[PDB]
Amino acid sequence: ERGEVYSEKLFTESERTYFFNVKENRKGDYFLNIVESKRSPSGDFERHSIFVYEENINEFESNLLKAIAVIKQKVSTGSSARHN
Amino acid sequence: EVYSEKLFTESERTYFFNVKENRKGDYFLNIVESKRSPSGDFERHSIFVYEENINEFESNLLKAIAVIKQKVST
């Protein structure tokens, strides 16, 4: 697909499915498009879409990594330890 | 609300990076894009990611971002 540089889909075990897209504009600049597609209880599809331009990618990335770190800090890990 | 950071840009787009806690105590990420219309009204685009999907969401986001970062350094 012309104008579409990269596209990946992520299914989850929840009603949320994500798309990670890299598109090219008229000038040849790239931009990111993150889409969440949520299936409502009724069966309708809600699409939430965020755009990030080439110029703000670095800051977007470092801020994403900082927010995710807060969650990764919280989450319980793999640990003679016996689970279940 | 566990964490909240705002990213201003030199454009009509502002981003929010939020970490919230639900009833159960599970964390979730919320990425918000605030788009400023010429009139002065704000468009809010919001994405939620549950704790259990955070690793896969992050690695997929980083793979897409890397594609852009590789272009700009070429």
Ligand SMILES: [Mg+2]
């Ligand atoms: Mg699913």
